[PDB]
Amino acid sequence: FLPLYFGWFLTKKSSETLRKAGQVFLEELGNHKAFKKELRHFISGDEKLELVSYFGKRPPGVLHCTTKACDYGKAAGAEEYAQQEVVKRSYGKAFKLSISALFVTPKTAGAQVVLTDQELQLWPSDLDKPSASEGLPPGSRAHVTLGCAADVQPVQTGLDLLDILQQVKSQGEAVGELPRGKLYSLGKGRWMLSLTKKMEVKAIFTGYYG
Ligand SMILES: [Cl-]
Ligand SMILES: [Cl-]
């Protein structure tokens, strides 16, 4: 049968680099003037919110960028995906993932991945498309999950990214400057840190089993 899901799994060095950059982002963001102002939109609670604790559910080991969730063949289009020539040829193969930004929402915290044309060939085209993936180029959903809220599923991270990229589609001024780049407030608890320099992480395309 098929793996739980295919994707690019970052090396140990790469994962810790991206992970630590994610922690710094949550710490810096939670301290920023603009975020403390929009706490009412980020949280309908009830005085500083520690975002690193908020996104308490983090990936236990190495970070990864998902391509296609298969659930051992139980997912729609799973069989059709794994039997592609490029998928079979790319299995166990080395890739560099380009991180363009870090983003935060009331549900998830993650990193936007800008896939190359070679890597876009590995992105699935199953018919059941998220409606937020429309008007945007394919592979826009590509991401690395950094953290989730208690009752949130990691699948949500992609949905949040697509929802964010619909807003940007463009935009106005940045509301602040962080050491790595410009910070944008997209409203409704949504934040995007556009990196001045895009991070490059090495990863291996393969299949993960439970
Ligand atoms: Cl790690
Ligand atoms: Cl997409």
Least Cα distance to 103 among 199, 25, 33, 20 occurs for 25
Closest ligand (CA of 22):
1
Cβ < 5 A residues, ion ligand 1: 15-16, 19
> How many angstroms separate the CA atoms of 10 and 22, rounded?
15
Split into its structural domains, the chain has a count of 1
Rounded to the nearest whole angstrom, what is the distance from the C-alpha of residue 125 to the centroid of ligand 2?
9
User: In three state form, how does the secondary structure of the chain look?
Assistant: CCCCEEEEEECHHHHHHHHHHHHHHHHHHHHCHHHHHCHHHHCCCCCCCCHHHHCCECCCCCCEEEEEECHHHCCCCHHHHHCCHHHHHCCCEEEEEEEEEEEECCCEEEEEEECCHHHHCCCCCCCCCCHHHCCCCCCCCCEEEEEECCCCCCCHHHHHHHHHHHHHCCCCCCCEEECCEEEEEEECCEEEEEEEEEEEEEEEEEEECC
Resolution value in angstroms: 2.5
- CATH number of the domain residue 76 falls in: 3.90.1740.10
Contacts of 16 (CB under 8 A, 6+ apart): none
> How many angstroms separate the CA atoms of 174 and 181, rounded?
10
* Number of Cβ within a 10 Å radius of residue 143: 23
> How many angstroms separate the CA atoms of 143 and 120, rounded?
13
For this PDB entry, the determination method is: X-ray
Rounded to the nearest whole angstrom, what is the distance from the C-alpha of residue 16 to the centroid of ligand 1?
4
Long-range contacts, stretch 177-182, CB < 8 angstroms, 24+ apart: 178/25, 178/28, 178/29, 178/32, 179/28, 180/21, 180/24, 180/25, 181/101
Domain span at residue 26 reads 1-210
Active site residues: 64, 143
